[PDB]
Amino acid sequence: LGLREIRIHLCQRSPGSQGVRDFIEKRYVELKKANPDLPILIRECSDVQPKLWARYAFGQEKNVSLNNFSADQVTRALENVLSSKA
Amino acid sequence: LHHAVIPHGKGGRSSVSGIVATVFGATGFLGRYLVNHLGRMGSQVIVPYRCEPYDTMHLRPMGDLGQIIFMDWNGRDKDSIRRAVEHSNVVINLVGREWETKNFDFEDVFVKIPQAIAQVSKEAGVEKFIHISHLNADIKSSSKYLRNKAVGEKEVRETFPEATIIKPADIFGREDRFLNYFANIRWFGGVPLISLGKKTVKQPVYIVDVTKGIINAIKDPDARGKTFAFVGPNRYLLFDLVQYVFAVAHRPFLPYPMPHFAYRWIGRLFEISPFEPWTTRDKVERIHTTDRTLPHLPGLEDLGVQATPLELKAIEVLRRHRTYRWLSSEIEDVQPAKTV
C-alpha cells in the first residue's frame, strides 16, 4: 500500500559503494527533509555489495542491487522507490 | 502443572513423557502392549497386580529404572485402588475375563470393579480415565459378557463423566484368544460354526492399533468424554475369516454346521473345568455375534491411528500353529478372505 522504510547498505572502502557514498555526502539531508517520518537506514559494513531495500506495507520488500552505480543512478533508483509505493 | 511432570527429552526409554498411568489389569493381553508402548516413551507406569509377581516378570524390561511401580491391589478393596490411583494423572481400566470364575462373575469384573476404579479415581483427583468396553455391548444381548459390559459402560459414564470409553471389535495379536481360538479347533474336530458362520460379520482390529489408540487418547485433550469405536479396516464374514485363519496355518479346513441348541452344550462341557476353560457358552455367543456398525462414534482414524488389516499381521499371529512341512511359507502365499 505504501513505502514504510528504506535500507541502504554500503561499504566504507569498496569502490562499488563509492557513488553510493557520494549519495550520502551530497544528497541525503534534503532527502531526510523530504520525508522526515520515513526511516532511511544507512548500514555500512565490511565487504558488502551496495543494496537498496524497500519495505512496503504488509511486509513486502523490494530489492535493488546498487553495485557500481554513480550518485545520479542511486538518486534515480531511490526516487523510483519513493515514487512507486507498490 | 508440576515441575517433575513436564515432558522432557526426545521420547525415548529414559525420557520423561509426563504421563503417570495406573494401568489396572496390565498383566493381560492389552496391558502387555500398553505398558510396552508407555514405557518406551519414558512414562511412570503404575501396575497394580493381582497375580503372582512371576506373572508380572515380562512387564519389567518394558521401561527405564523406577518407571514401572508394581503394587498389590484387590478389586473388592477400595483401599488398594486409592493407594494406586492417588498419584497418577491417567488411569486405564483393562480388567476382564472371558469366563466367570468361582468368586468373580461378569458383574464383579465389568460392573462392580470398573465403577469402583472410576469412583475412586474421581474422588482422588485423576483427570483422565480410560475404560475399555466391547463393540457389541448391549443391554438385550444374548451373552452375559456384553450385557454386564454395557451396564459397566453406563456406570463408568455416569460416575466419571469425562472418561474415554473405547469400543474394540475383536482384538487380534500374538497372545489373543481370537485367532488362536480359531486356530485351536483343529484339535477338537472340524471347526463347528453356527449356520456355517455366514450370518455373522466381523471386523477385527489389530492390538498395536488399539494400543496407539489408547495412547493417542491419553495425549488428546479432545478425547475427554468421547466414546471411541476401534475397528479394523475390513469387515469379514465369520466363515471366510476362519477359512483365512486355517489357510494361513495350512491346516485342513473342513467346516460343518452345528445348531444353536447343541453348540451351547459343547460350551457347558468345557466350562466345568476349574482351570481357565477352553471355551464357554458365552464365547459361543460372542464368536457368533456380528460386529455392529456404529458410524456416529469416532474411531482410530480420528485419533490418527491407521488401522492395520488382517492380511499383514495374520502371518505374525498364525505362524505358531503351522507344522514344519509348511512352517516357512510366506505372507503372500495365501489368497485373502472375502470382505463385505
Binding site: - | 526426545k10 525415548g12 529414559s14 502392549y33 524390561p61 527405564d64
Partner: protein, 208 residues
C-alpha cells in the same frame, strides 16, 4: 638419579640407530623417517606404497629376520589430512629385537594388505577395517570382526562418540531385540583435566 629413574641402555640405542641407517639406505624408495626413542625403540616411518616391499624385506633379509608380527594397529589423529596411522610391530626372534614400521592413510585411500607377508595380519587389518574404516586391498576375507552385524560407523575413530548412536533393548511388541537412538539416564561426565602449566620443556613445540 639412581633409584627412581629408569636406566638408559645406550648400546641398544646405538645398535638400533645403526640398523635404522641400514634400513634407510637399503630402502630409500619408501622410507621417510627413521627415529630411535629415548628408551631405545626403533621406528621406520614409510610411505603406504611400500607396505609389501619393506615388510617382505624385514621378514626375509638375513640381517633383519623379523619373522613375528606382534601387533598391527591404526591410530586416528584427525588434525592430519591422512588421519590414520597404521603401525606394524615386528619381532625378530633371531636378533632378539623389535621394530616399528609406521605408515599413513585417510578414509579413502586403500592400504595394500600385508597378508602376503605375515598371515597374522589376516584378522588385524580386518579389525582396522572394523574399527577405523581403512580399506585393505587384496585381503582374503575382509569383513567386520568386533562390532555388531548391522553396525553403521567406525568405533575407534575419534569423531565417533563414546556411547554410539544406537542402543539395544528387548521389545515385547515385536518380540525382538531392537535398536533405538541412545539416551543415557546419566550423561558421561566429561572432565577437563589438562593443567595450564607446561610439564615437559623438552617436548615444547615452537610457536607460529
Amino acid at each position: 638419579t639412581r633409584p627412581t629413574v629408569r636406566p638408559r641402555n645406550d648400546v641398544a640405542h646405538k645398535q638400533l640407530s645403526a640398523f635404522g641407517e641400514y634400513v634407510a639406505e637399503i630402502l630409500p624408495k619408501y622410507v621417510q623417517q627413521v627415529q630411535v626413542s629415548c628408551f631405545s625403540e626403533l621406528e621406520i616411518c614409510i610411505h603406504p606404497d611400500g607396505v609389501i616391499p619393506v615388510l617382505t624385506f624385514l621378514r626375509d633379509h638375513s640381517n633383519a629376520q623379523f619373522k613375528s608380527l606382534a601387533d598391527l594397529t591404526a591410530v586416528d589423529i584427525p588434525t592430519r589430512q591422512n588421519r590414520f596411522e597404521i603401525v606394524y610391530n615386528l619381532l625378530s626372534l633371531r636378533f632378539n629385537s623389535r621394530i616399528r614400521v609406521k605408515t599413513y592413510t585417510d578414509e579413502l585411500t586403500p592400504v595394500e594388505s600385508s597378508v602376503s607377508v605375515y598371515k597374522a595380519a589376516n584378522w588385524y587389518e580386518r579389525e582396522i577395517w572394523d574399527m577405523f574404516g581403512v580399506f585393505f586391498a587384496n585381503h582374503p576375507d575382509l569383513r567386520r570382526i568386533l562390532t555388531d552385524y548391522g553396525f553403521e560407523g567406525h568405533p575407534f575413530r575419534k569423531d565417533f562418540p563414546l556411547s554410539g548412536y544406537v542402543e539395544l533393548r528387548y521389545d515385547d511388541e515385536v518380540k525382538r531385540v531392537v535398536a533405538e537412538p541412545v539416551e543415557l539416564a546419566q550423561e558421561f561426565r566429561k572432565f577437563d583435566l589438562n593443567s595450564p602449566w607446561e610439564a615437559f620443556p623438552a617436548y615444547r613445540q615452537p610457536p607460529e
